[PDB]
């Protein structure tokens, strides 16, 4: 966290800084998208964070 890295989450790849979110997902959701249909949040698979 708090560094940018070539990340992957269940095959959701990207590059960016990872930091903790005030947003809550529903129990079944895995990643978040902005108004521009682009990814801006993701859940950790092992820590559900």
């Amino acid at each position: 966290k708090n560094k940018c890295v070539n990340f992957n989450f269940n095959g959701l790849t990207g590059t960016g800084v990872l930091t903790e979110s005030n947003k809550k997902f529903l129990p079944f959701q895995q990643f978040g998208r902005d108004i521009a249909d682009t990814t801006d949040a993701v859940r950790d698979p092992q820590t559900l964070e």
Binding site: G16, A36, T38, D40
Partner: peptide, 25 residues
């Protein structure tokens, strides 16, 4: 009147600031 960086788009500020335009007006 009421009012993306992830995709290489940058929306850099104007030269004159709003408090400077306020001084000219």
């Amino acid at each position: 009147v009421t009012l993306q960086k992830f995709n290489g788009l940058t929306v850099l500020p104007p030269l004159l600031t709003d408090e400077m335009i306020a001084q000219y007006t």
